Design an enzyme around this catalytic site. Structure first.
Site, PDB file in Angstrom:
ATOM      1  CE  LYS A  52     -12.205 106.136  30.806  1.00 30.29           C
ATOM      2  NZ  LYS A  52     -11.210 107.213  31.010  1.00 30.29           N
ATOM      3  CE  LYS A  64     -10.942  95.863  36.673  1.00 24.27           C
ATOM      4  NZ  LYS A  64      -9.684  96.298  37.326  1.00 24.27           N
ATOM      5  CB  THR A  93     -22.403  82.753  51.291  1.00 25.21           C
ATOM      6  OG1 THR A  93     -22.445  83.987  51.963  1.00 25.21           O
ATOM      7  CG2 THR A  93     -23.039  82.783  49.912  1.00 25.21           C
ATOM      8  NE  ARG A 141     -37.327  75.747  41.881  1.00 29.35           N
ATOM      9  CZ  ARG A 141     -37.658  77.041  41.885  1.00 29.35           C
ATOM     10  NH1 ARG A 141     -36.752  77.988  42.136  1.00 29.35           N
ATOM     11  NH2 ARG A 141     -38.923  77.399  41.623  1.00 29.35           N
ATOM     12  CB  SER A 172     -43.466  81.178  40.757  1.00 26.76           C
ATOM     13  OG  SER A 172     -42.956  80.445  41.867  1.00 26.76           O
ATOM     14  NE  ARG A 175     -44.952  84.191  38.846  1.00 29.07           N
ATOM     15  CZ  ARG A 175     -43.638  84.485  38.937  1.00 29.07           C
ATOM     16  NH1 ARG A 175     -43.155  85.646  38.483  1.00 29.07           N
ATOM     17  NH2 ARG A 175     -42.775  83.596  39.496  1.00 29.07           N
ATOM     18  N   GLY A 181     -39.798  77.895  44.717  1.00 26.56           N
ATOM     19  CA  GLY A 181     -38.696  77.924  45.687  1.00 26.56           C
ATOM     20  C   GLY A 181     -39.119  77.732  47.145  1.00 26.56           C
ATOM     21  CG  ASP A 248     -41.083  83.495  54.285  1.00 27.81           C
ATOM     22  OD1 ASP A 248     -40.408  82.698  54.929  1.00 27.81           O
ATOM     23  OD2 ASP A 248     -40.542  84.337  53.440  1.00 27.81           O
TER      24      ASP A 248
HETATM   25 CO   LIG Z   1     -40.535  84.126  49.715  1.00 28.79          CO
HETATM   26 CO   LIG Z   2     -40.856  82.158  46.794  1.00 30.23          CO
HETATM   27 NA    NA Z   3     -27.308  81.667  52.768  1.00 29.32          NA
HETATM   28 NA    NA Z   4     -17.611 107.465  30.950  1.00 38.14          NA
END
Ligand SMILES: [Co+2]
Ligand SMILES: [Co+2]
Ligand code: NA
Ligand code: NA
Ligand SMILES: Nc1ncnc2c1ncn2[C@H]1C[C@H](O)[C@@H](COP(=O)(O)OP(=O)(O)OP(=O)(O)O)O1
Length: 327
Positions: A52, A64, A93, A141, A172, A175, A181, A248
């Site tokens: 706090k 909480k 999502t 992956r 990556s 790298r 991904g 991309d």
């Molecule tokens: Co990308």
């Molecule tokens: Co990427």
């Molecule tokens: Na999505």
């Molecule tokens: Na505060």
DNA sequence: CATTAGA
DNA sequence: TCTAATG
């Protein structure tokens, strides 16, 4: 980093839920600065009150925090973690091109699942259509083994289309990364730069190329400087076909590659860290350039770069192999 | 932090 | 045009 863990994690869960399920930007935005400062905190948070004391922590969060300290759980959290409507958004999502806005709207209409999505494939737009198609493969992956093969191909075409192209498989992958991904290809050409009024075909051409031979298989969105697709390795002498992969391609004014290139290579930390250093060293670095710092506060004046070297040199660092761009 | 869709 | 989604 761990003393403050569980606190920050619940905090992030809370925040997360606000921004998505509900539309509580503030609450949501609140939860994070909180989750931020509490994380900086050097000592073990012993109690609400203790927390706090922090900046960004009001009575609500503290409250909480107490409950969480008190009992390894949190009701509101258990309650959210339960709720289907909420659960559902969290899921829908995942579909590429499905954001929360849409997540919520679908739910509304009763599209909670993947199957639901299919039955109403009409309600989905092309992006989401692909997202749905490749839902499985979109999550997988990419093994570098594959990464190398893809890269090989793209480079090949790029070349053949125009010998003048300069292309970099950033990320990556660049790298070392055992996996990745998606694939990011940084493009540029000598006939494109800061000034030289576009040359859209420049992107177009290669795109076509890649599709021509069937490496690009779909288009998520293709504009004049950024292309966004799906690609795939030729499934060999069959028995094993290859997954669909996010990809991309971005055109760059040759007069800003390495920056951008530097930039995409990252890591995130290498960035900031390299970024903070250029500051003492009297500079400014960002996604496109590097500008010498003027003492009056700021200053401008884009420094001329021909390689990732040029940049380090400037800020006089040690040339860091991408390999070791980790932090 | 910006580029593309979309409606 | 604004607004969404990905990066
Ligand atoms: Co990308
Ligand atoms: Co990427
Ligand atoms: Na999505
Ligand atoms: Na505060
Ligand atoms: C930032 C990090 C990279 O420079 C760039 C985005 O590339 P991105 O693919 O999102 O990350 P990455 O290449 O580090 O991860 P990965 O390839 O594992 O998904 O912008």
């Amino acid at each position: 980093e761990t003393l403050n863990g569980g606190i920050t994690d619940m905090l992030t869960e809370l925040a997360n839920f606000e921004k998505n399920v509900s539309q509580a930007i503030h609450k949501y935005n609140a939860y994070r600065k909180a989750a931020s400062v509490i994380a900086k905190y050097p000592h073990k948070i012993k109690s609400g009150a203790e927390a706090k004391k922090l900046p960004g922590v009001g009575t609500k969060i503290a409250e909480k925090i107490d409950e969480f300290l008190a009992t390894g759980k949190l009701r509101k959290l258990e309650k959210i973690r339960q709720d289907d409507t909420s659960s559902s958004i969290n899921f829908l999502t995942r579909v590429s091109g499905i954001g929360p806005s849409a997540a919520r709207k679908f739910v509304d209409e009763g599209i909670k699942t993947l199957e639901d999505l299919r039955k109403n494939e009409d309600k989905l737009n092309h992006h989401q259509r692909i997202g749905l198609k490749y839902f499985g493969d979109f999550e997988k992956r990419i093994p570098r083994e594959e990464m190398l093969q893809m890269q090989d191909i793209v480079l090949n075409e790029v070349k053949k289309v125009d010998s003048e192209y300069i292309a970099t498989v950033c990320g990556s992958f660049r790298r070392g990364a055992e996996s990745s991904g998606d694939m990011d290809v940084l493009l540029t050409h000598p006939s494109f730069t800061s000034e030289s009024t576009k040359q859209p075909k420049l992107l177009h051409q290669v795109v076509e190329q890649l599709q021509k031979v069937h490496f690009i298989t779909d288009t998520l969105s293709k504009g004049e400087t950024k292309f966004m697709g799906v690609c795939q390795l030729p499934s060999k002498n069959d028995e094993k076909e290859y997954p669909h992969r996010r990809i991309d391609i971005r055109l760059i004014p040759k007069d800003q590659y390495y920056c951008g290139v530097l930039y995409f290579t990252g890591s995130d930390i290498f960035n900031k860290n390299m970024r903070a250093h250029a500051l003492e060293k009297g500079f400014t670095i960002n996604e496109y350039t590097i500008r010498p710092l003027g003492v009056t506060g700021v200053a401008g004046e884009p420094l001329p770069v021909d390689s990732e070297k040029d940049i380090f040199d400037y800020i006089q660092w040690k040339y860091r192999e991408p390999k070791d761009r980790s932090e």
